[PDB]
Amino acid sequence: RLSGMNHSAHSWGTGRAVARIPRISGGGTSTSGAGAFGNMCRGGRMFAPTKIFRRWHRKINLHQKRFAVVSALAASSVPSLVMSRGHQIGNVPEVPLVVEDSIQGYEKTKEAMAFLKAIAAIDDVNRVNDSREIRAGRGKMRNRRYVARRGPMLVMPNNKGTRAFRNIFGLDLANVSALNLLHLAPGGHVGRFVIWTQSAFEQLDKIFGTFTEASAVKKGFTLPAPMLTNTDVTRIMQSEEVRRVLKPKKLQAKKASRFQTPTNGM
Amino acid sequence: ASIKCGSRRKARRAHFQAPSHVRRVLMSAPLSKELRAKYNVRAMPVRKDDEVIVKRGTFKGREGKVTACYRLKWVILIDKVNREKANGSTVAVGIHPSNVEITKLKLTHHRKSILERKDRS
RNA sequence: AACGUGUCGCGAUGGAUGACUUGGCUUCCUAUUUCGUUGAAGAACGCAGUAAAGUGCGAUAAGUGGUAUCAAUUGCAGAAUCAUUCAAUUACCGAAUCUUUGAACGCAAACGGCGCAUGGGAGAAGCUCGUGUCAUCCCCGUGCAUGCCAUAUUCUCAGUGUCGAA
RNA sequence: AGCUGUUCGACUGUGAAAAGGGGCAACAGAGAACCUGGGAUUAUAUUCCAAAAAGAAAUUGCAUGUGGGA
RNA sequence: GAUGUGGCCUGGAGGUUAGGACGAAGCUUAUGGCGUGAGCCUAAGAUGGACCGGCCUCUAGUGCAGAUCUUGGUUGGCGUAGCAAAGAUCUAACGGAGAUAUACUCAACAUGCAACGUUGGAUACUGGAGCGGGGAAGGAUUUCGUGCCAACGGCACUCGUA
RNA sequence: UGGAAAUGGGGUGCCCCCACCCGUCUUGAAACACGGACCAAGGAGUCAAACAGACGCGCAAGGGAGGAGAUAUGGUUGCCAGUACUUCUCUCGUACUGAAAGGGAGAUGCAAAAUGCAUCUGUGGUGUGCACACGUCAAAUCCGUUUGAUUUGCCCAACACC
RNA sequence: CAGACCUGAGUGUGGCAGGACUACCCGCCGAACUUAAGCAUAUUACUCAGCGGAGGAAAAGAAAACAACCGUGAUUCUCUCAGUGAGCGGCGAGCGAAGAGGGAACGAACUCGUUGCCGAAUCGGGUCUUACAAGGCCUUGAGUUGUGGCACAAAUAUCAUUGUGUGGUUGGUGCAGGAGUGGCGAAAUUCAAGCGAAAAGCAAACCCGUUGCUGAAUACAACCCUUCAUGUGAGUAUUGAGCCAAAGAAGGUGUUAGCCCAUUGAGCCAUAAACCUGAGCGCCUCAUGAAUAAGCGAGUAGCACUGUUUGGGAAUGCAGUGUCAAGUUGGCAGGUAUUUGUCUGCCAAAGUUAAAUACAGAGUAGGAAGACCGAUAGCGAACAAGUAGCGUGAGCGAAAGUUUGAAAAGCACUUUGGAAAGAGAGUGAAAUAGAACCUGAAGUCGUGACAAAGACAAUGGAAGUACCUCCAUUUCAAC
Numbered sequence A: 001r002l003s004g005m006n007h008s009a010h011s012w013g014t015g016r017a018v019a020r021i022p023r024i025s026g027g028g029t030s031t032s033g034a035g036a037f038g039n040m041c042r043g044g045r046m047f048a049p050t051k052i053f054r055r056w057h058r059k060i061n062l063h064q065k066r067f068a069v070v071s072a073l074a075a076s077s078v079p080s081l082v083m084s085r086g087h088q089i090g091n092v093p094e095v096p097l098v099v100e101d102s103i104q105g106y107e108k109t110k111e112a113m114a115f116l117k118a119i120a121a122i123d124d125v126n127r128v129n130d131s132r133e134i135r136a137g138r139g140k141m142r143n144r145r146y147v148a149r150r151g152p153m154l155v156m157p158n159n160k161g162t163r164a165f166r167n168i169f170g171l172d173l174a175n176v177s178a179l180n181l182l183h184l185a186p187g188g189h190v191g192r193f194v195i196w197t198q199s200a201f202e203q204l205d206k207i208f209g210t211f212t213e214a215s216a217v218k219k220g221f222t223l224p225a226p227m228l229t230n231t232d233v234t235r236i237m238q239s240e241e242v243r244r245v246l247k248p249k250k251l252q253a254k255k256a257s258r259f260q261t262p263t264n265g266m
Numbered sequence B: 001a002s003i004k005c006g007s008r009r010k011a012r013r014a015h016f017q018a019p020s021h022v023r024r025v026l027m028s029a030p031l032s033k034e035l036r037a038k039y040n041v042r043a044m045p046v047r048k049d050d051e052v053i054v055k056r057g058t059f060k061g062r063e064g065k066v067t068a069c070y071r072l073k074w075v076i077l078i079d080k081v082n083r084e085k086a087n088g089s090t091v092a093v094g095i096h097p098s099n100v101e102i103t104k105l106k107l108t109h110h111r112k113s114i115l116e117r118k119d120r121s
Numbered sequence C: 001a002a003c004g005u006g007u008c009g010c011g012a013u014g015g016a017u018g019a020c021u022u023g024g025c026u027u028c029c030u031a032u033u034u035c036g037u038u039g040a041a042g043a044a045c046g047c048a049g050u051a052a053a054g055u056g057c058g059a060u061a062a063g064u065g066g067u068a069u070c071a072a073u074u075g076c077a078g079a080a081u082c083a084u085u086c087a088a089u090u091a092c093c094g095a096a097u098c099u100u101u102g103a104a105c106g107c108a109a110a111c112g113g114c115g116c117a118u119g120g121g122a123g124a125a126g127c128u129c130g131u132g133u134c135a136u137c138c139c140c141g142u143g144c145a146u147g148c149c150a151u152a153u154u155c156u157c158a159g160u161g162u163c164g165a166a
Numbered sequence D: 001a002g003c004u005g006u007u008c009g010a011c012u013g014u015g016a017a018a019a020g021g022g023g024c025a026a027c028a029g030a031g032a033a034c035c036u037g038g039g040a041u042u043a044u045a046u047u048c049c050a051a052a053a054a055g056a057a058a059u060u061g062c063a064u065g066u067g068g069g070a
Numbered sequence E: 001g002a003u004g005u006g007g008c009c010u011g012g013a014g015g016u017u018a019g020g021a022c023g024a025a026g027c028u029u030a031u032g033g034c035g036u037g038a039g040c041c042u043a044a045g046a047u048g049g050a051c052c053g054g055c056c057u058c059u060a061g062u063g064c065a066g067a068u069c070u071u072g073g074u075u076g077g078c079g080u081a082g083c084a085a086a087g088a089u090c091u092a093a094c095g096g097a098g099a100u101a102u103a104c105u106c107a108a109c110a111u112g113c114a115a116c117g118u119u120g121g122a123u124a125c126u127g128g129a130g131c132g133g134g135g136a137a138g139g140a141u142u143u144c145g146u147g148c149c150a151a152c153g154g155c156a157c158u159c160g161u162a
Numbered sequence F: 001u002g003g004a005a006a007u008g009g010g011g012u013g014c015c016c017c018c019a020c021c022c023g024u025c026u027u028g029a030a031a032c033a034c035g036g037a038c039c040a041a042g043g044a045g046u047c048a049a050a051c052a053g054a055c056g057c058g059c060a061a062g063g064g065a066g067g068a069g070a071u072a073u074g075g076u077u078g079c080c081a082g083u084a085c086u087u088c089u090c091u092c093g094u095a096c097u098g099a100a101a102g103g104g105a106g107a108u109g110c111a112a113a114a115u116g117c118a119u120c121u122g123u124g125g126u127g128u129g130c131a132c133a134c135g136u137c138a139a140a141u142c143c144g145u146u147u148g149a150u151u152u153g154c155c156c157a158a159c160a161c162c
Numbered sequence G: 001c002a003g004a005c006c007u008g009a010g011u012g013u014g015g016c017a018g019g020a021c022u023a024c025c026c027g028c029c030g031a032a033c034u035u036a037a038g039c040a041u042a043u044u045a046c047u048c049a050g051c052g053g054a055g056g057a058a059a060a061g062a063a064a065a066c067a068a069c070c071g072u073g074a075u076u077c078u079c080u081c082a083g084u085g086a087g088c089g090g091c092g093a094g095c096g097a098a099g100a101g102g103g104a105a106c107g108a109a110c111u112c113g114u115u116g117c118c119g120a121a122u123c124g125g126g127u128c129u130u131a132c133a134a135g136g137c138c139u140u141g142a143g144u145u146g147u148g149g150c151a152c153a154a155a156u157a158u159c160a161u162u163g164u165g166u167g168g169u170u171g172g173u174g175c176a177g178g179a180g181u182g183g184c185g186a187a188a189u190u191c192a193a194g195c196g197a198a199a200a201g202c203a204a205a206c207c208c209g210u211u212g213c214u215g216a217a218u219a220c221a222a223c224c225c226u227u228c229a230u231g232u233g234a235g236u237a238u239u240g241a242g243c244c245a246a247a248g249a250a251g252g253u254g255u256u257a258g259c260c261c262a263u264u265g266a267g268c269c270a271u272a273a274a275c276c277u278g279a280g281c282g283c284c285u286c287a288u289g290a291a292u293a294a295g296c297g298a299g300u301a302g303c304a305c306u307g308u309u310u311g312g313g314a315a316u317g318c319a320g321u322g323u324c325a326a327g328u329u330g331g332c333a334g335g336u337a338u339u340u341g342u343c344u345g346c347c348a349a350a351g352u353u354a355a356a357u358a359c360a361g362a363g364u365a366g367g368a369a370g371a372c373c374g375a376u377a378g379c380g381a382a383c384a385a386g387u388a389g390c391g392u393g394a395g396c397g398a399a400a401g402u403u404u405g406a407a408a409a410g411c412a413c414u415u416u417g418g419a420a421a422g423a424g425a426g427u428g429a430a431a432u433a434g435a436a437c438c439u440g441a442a443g444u445c446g447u448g449a450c451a452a453a454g455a456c457a458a459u460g461g462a463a464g465u466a467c468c469u470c471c472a473u474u475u476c477a478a479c
């Protein structure tokens, strides 16, 4: 609050042939008589100095938060949306990818590395590995020196079983009870590659509920109703029921020839 | 000696403002393959009268004996690693300890205790 | 012609920009986390083999002691040992040193000034038989401000205060 | 050489009389015992000079001896 | 003056996709191409020597020609105004790198100028209310010897309170 | 198939025509009005809170916290000051009026009680008013229709009278 | 006379105060600029400046409290109440709380005076017990002008006596464990390919691919032609083969590093006291639990005039001075003054008290950082910065990155010069990296080459043309 303002710095007036700006008092220094206190002056105060009452944090409606997580979960089950986001899923057996629960008993990272190779989730892990590099700006001077891509997300039913997966670079770990939208939609883009443990997959119907059955953990929460039942509007536009009420096609005028048409009617 | 942390500025301040005894550990060199098998220790801090071989840089492959561990210039001096000045006099060139590898250890009673407590078996 | 003008290549002056960052700013946390008359904070002088500033220290003065640690510090020089402790160097701390001042407090002060009590020190005059002792002079330690509280083997006193005995 | 009283110094239990705390403030006021010669310097000198002090003094404070009182 | 712009640009963040020691940012341009434009891109560097580009979203100390604007540097005027109170210096010798310093021709002048310190002479000034010998205040090593001539003594210095 | 032939761009000069100095107050500036030697870096609608309107989003007669707790996390250098979960509360609405004491809004039918009875699938009524539904005209048809108008019914949103 | 005790001196002995810090906190004192589009009440603001005083927090705090209920229950803080259909206000500008409700914290409670029953059982000081014991003995020393014990609503006795059992907070004595501190303490390639050009690529989701293929760099070095020279620092790069991971952690190292180094963890060792643990566990000592009525805080509370403060309005707190109670309609509060009489809550005028709360220009010892700044920015200060310098003084107060290089290898030696330096030569990948040396802009200047050019100040627009062009594109045979 006192930066740029820790001087006496009175203005000189008009009788002297200098601009009317506060000037540093005294003599015997190179700073004496120098312009002070202004955003234009060197060593002066910045325009509208920054304060700590700036609104750093936001309130989001609880239903809008749950709506967003549900939308990011639906998008993770569409292979074309996962591919569009950048993930390499050209060898994984199925989307959504669900594996057995035995991976929580792994003790060595070698076991976890072999499992990621078997379900063909190593292509997205390798993509993150090749993407490691130094950050491309001042952020590397800050504590943000390295950048990398995202890779697959492994969702476990509880806190256990992560010991063999913590050190694998390019693999994120999640909990079905607490699913983060910042990790389901990194960068704001839906379509994250998610690997589901089996017990986490069977918990999804009781955590987020159904269109008719309320969620067990989210009090009174049901999945939102669609604005469109079919959502395939092209199929409707090309349906025989629509086509049979469409206005008949008409023969159009012949395209003008390469010769200019008469204009002088006299 | 536990310099790396989440803050780069704090980590670089701890390294370049390290005391002399901290710089001894920071200026460590790997043992040879025969010394690793015998002592079950991957690396030891270099000291004077140790025999090393350069493994990185211009003098790569040059064997010699450590004649000084400066710790202020962050380098070690090897008797056989040297060059001539303009007037023809010979001066020692400082090599970073992590660029060399220890082939023979100078064993004292307290040095032998460091090897025993660092044994991995 | 010459001055001058323009364009280009190359030099000069000048230190922008970029990249770097042991610095700042801002937020959060952890504690057997708050100085001093047992003399603080601040101010002054000094200390290294070499040393202006700065740093650390105080006549034990770039430091003594003790614990760890384990072969340095380093511009040069010096250095018993090349090192279980008893002598590397770093880090930390229980033992110590800690000049002149400053609330500064024996009294003063543009004075490195002047004391009173009490212990010492040195004393080539004199006395004694170069030994002892030592007048004047000189040096050093401790105490000595003011106010308040408590206290006195129950210390010494004052009052045409109240008595009580003469 | 011993005792009594008697003069002067030191030592103590009785204590006449002395009203008015402690300091600072003058390098031109008060006060203050040394002044010549030097071949004694590169730079200080009424400050240095050593037995023939180049030397001549003046002043304090203590003592010893001689002399006169006590 | 309002508004719009899959309109341009800058520092950071979340994603994604790339480049770099066979050369990153930055910098230079008779260096061409594209865009109505803000601008983008390529080429070359006989530059540089290590980081950084595109796209979507987020964000802010986000765009300069001028405020007698702030700071730094430069700049015509300009080799210009000037460096004119206190009279004044001259000579030889020595010292000094500071000279008597020459393709050809040529005896020397007409091709090394101008300026220093010391000593001896000459001339002059201060003129005892002195550019004389002391001290206070103030200054605090300017005192002394030797060495020295980069910067300083607004010309000079071999001299100096440097 | 070359120090080449073209075309475009770039550079410099020259002709013939055009052509007042920028920023700024101002009715009027090329002004004998003010600020303007050059360049580099810096330099000015920001943050917070209350309210409103437009637009985006969620839910809806209900919406939403906040504070705080719980445990994934009684864990982790950090990521994680985030995310995930909860609230007999609180708040803004669903009702308004009066200075207050206090009161407190349906329709239809029958009837006229100083709280009248009955029923409840329902715009209080009227005029104008999207779509829709039966038709009806005029025009064009590739004879399937389509595009304008319009009668009636119901009129949604609105507007106006009761 | 003595002598006493009352008041007061002197000295000895043992102590304390003094100053610093002061961000937060407590007490007082206290503006104005500003807003009101003027200004005086008002606002700023019960704020700045000023004077005192503490602490790790302070202050407050156990109802003379809310309420008006089905009632709550010390204080402090948070959301909320509430920017308020409260209120205050030239009723203007503006200002402006409280109860309740959801929570944080909470083992939260005690002490004195008084009144009853006792009455020195009290306190200092000596000495002893391993002891300046909460202990024994002594002590006129202090205190009877009263200090100590017992009981007062969480209550219904205490005080003996023997047994019962409790205190690690009564004091001596001494034995454990832990926490906390300090030290120590983890994996895996310096693997293979060597240099201007393959230490490079291509087979166009995935696989084929553990495979096949292979060079438009016979490079480039400045008008172009020959001849002779010269030029690639260090692999954290590429490629191939592997390996570690309970460790991928983000720092260093000559380029971009999991495997070069430090690190990243279980664990191990060592401990003044204090802290935590059947209020840890023994011995001595010392303490200790269980089985009749009366009062309760007086120059105080009120009240009256002033003055200030508050939303507090016929007066919310407070201050001065005047006046001054009740306790047998007992007193205070119940937010419109008075006189009554009913109801409800509580019982002022002594005192202590932890947590939740602040740290709005503080410190000590450590940690986490950040959508922040990036050397005219960020603190004034990235650096011998509150420094150099300035002012009689109070005070004011900079500029400045030593980022040469990977390493000083910091240019030996020759030659000209008095020297500074120049010309060579060397080191280095690079001196156009040569010492406050990375890059090295703009502006301005010098030089070589060239374009020209009267005086129309110059610049500028549009159209051509002359000459140039290390620029781009196209074409080059029946095209």
Ligand SMILES: [K+]
Pocket (backbone or CB within 6 Å): A005, A006, A007, A008
């Ligand atoms: K100020």
Ligand SMILES: [K+]
Pocket (backbone or CB within 6 Å): A004, A039, A041, A043, A044, A045, A046
């Ligand atoms: K600024």
Ligand SMILES: [K+]
Pocket (backbone or CB within 6 Å): A059, A060, A061, A062, F064, F065
């Ligand atoms: K919300």
Ligand SMILES: [K+]
Pocket (backbone or CB within 6 Å): A130, A131, A132, A133
């Ligand atoms: K990359």
Ligand SMILES: [K+]
Pocket (backbone or CB within 6 Å): A132, A133, A134, G256
């Ligand atoms: K990289």
Ligand SMILES: [K+]
Pocket (backbone or CB within 6 Å): none
């Ligand atoms: K990017």
Ligand SMILES: [K+]
Pocket (backbone or CB within 6 Å): none
């Ligand atoms: K320069």
Ligand SMILES: [K+]
Pocket (backbone or CB within 6 Å): C017
């Ligand atoms: K820069």
Ligand SMILES: [K+]
Pocket (backbone or CB within 6 Å): none
């Ligand atoms: K010092």
Ligand SMILES: [K+]
Pocket (backbone or CB within 6 Å): none
């Ligand atoms: K003596």
Ligand SMILES: [K+]
Pocket (backbone or CB within 6 Å): C159
């Ligand atoms: K008397």
Ligand SMILES: [K+]
Pocket (backbone or CB within 6 Å): D027
């Ligand atoms: K004087």
Ligand SMILES: [K+]
Pocket (backbone or CB within 6 Å): none
């Ligand atoms: K003498």
Ligand SMILES: [K+]
Pocket (backbone or CB within 6 Å): A084, A085, A086, A189, E016
């Ligand atoms: K994307």
Ligand SMILES: [K+]
Pocket (backbone or CB within 6 Å): E018, E019, E053
């Ligand atoms: K690119």
Ligand SMILES: [K+]
Pocket (backbone or CB within 6 Å): none
């Ligand atoms: K500019």
